[PDB]
């Protein structure tokens, strides 16, 4: 969809007599985009020369070509977008120096735009360096540095070049921070023997980068510390979801490949056994238990009050729309709160798929309804989180996920729309992404009516409604 910049320049000067057809030719660049690699110093000089001297926003593009090209240049189609943006800055810097020499729009001038762009690149390069080395604490300090850079780049946040870079860095920082879940931060002194087994297996399989010591901790703990293993082990519904952890417990090694054709006891999914040896707050670390509750394959005398109590606590603590705006540091805290309950992006997807399987007593049916609301609200949260950035790019992706209920679930359209009909989305989607009229009118001080029509048109093609 990206234009051939040089071909667009050739068509531009051949049609420079008709300002209308020259406006339609340059609109292919504004609607689509130009590759940042195609914006060389020589190409900028000819693009300005090919533009009509007056008419529509051609005067704005001529006077402020740096802002205009930055607002339509793309870097995401490059192997390294940050290095591509740096070279884009060099070409725009060569153009300004090799062609030196009105105060209408101060933020949109060439000198103000280019130095603000390099200011962003320097922060992003230092942030990219810190995250690459780590492949008050560093996590909070990089989050603060990025959000300050995004705040200072507010007048340019709608520029495709800086919007893509902020989008690239935010998603990269979010992905890195969501891996920093060490087991020792979530260990409770009240954790039982089954709690510890499921917790260690959870963090070693989902966060091995920061839990490399769990392999020897699990081996030492299982061999020398557990004493009630034969109680919560059996040799039943939901047992197929416990087979991997049951084998590693039976062998005493988290790194053991699934046997050589060996039979072993499975961690019990019996409700009365789980009521004794599992803390109710760790229920979502027990997939076999959640399996039985979702499928309602349970007897009338199984006591489920402890797990219904936990579901109510989760519903009251996390499932409502907050009043204030939730910024990047708030979203990171919520992940750690959800990880504490056993919810990450992967386990929410598996539980959301597990809940689609259709199943009796009303009290068992109510817990399934509570689980579905919890699982699908946190599933939606992790889908928006991994594509979050305070830019129009995330706003579009957010609408596709909420309005269309896009996901990766398996099933016919009938059972897919059936499970979403039994879900009321009140989860925190109040993510920080706002460019309002106060922001707009502050940056368009001396904008003429022809310049304002172009700016409104560019914002509409990126945001849609506002």
UniProtKB/Swiss-Prot annotation:
Role description: Plays an essential role in cytoplasmic secondary envelopment during viral egress. Interacts with the capsid via the large tegument protein/LTP and participates in its transport to the host trans-Golgi network (TGN) where secondary envelopment occurs. Modulates tegumentation and capsid accumulation at the viral assembly complex.
> Where is it localised?
Virion tegument; Host cytoplasm; Host nucleus; Host Golgi apparatus, Host trans-Golgi network
Domain of life, per UniProt, equals Viruses
Q: Which organism is it from?
A: Human cytomegalovirus (strain AD169)
Subunit details: Interacts (via C-terminus) with the large tegument protein/LTP (via N-terminus).
Q: Name one GO cellular component term.
A: viral tegument
Transmembrane ranges, per UniProt, are: none
Record bears the keyword Ligase: no
Swiss-Prot/TrEMBL keywords = Host cytoplasm, Host Golgi apparatus, Host nucleus, Virion, Virion tegument
Chaperone as a keyword? no
Which protein are we looking at? Inner tegument protein
User: Where does it primarily localize?
Assistant: virion
Q: Which family does it belong to?
A: Belongs to the herpesviridae inner tegument protein family.
Q: Which residues form a coiled coil?
A: none
> The organism's lineage?
Viruses, Duplodnaviria, Heunggongvirae, Peploviricota, Herviviricetes
Q: Give the UniProt record's GO annotations in the biological process aspect.
A: virion assembly
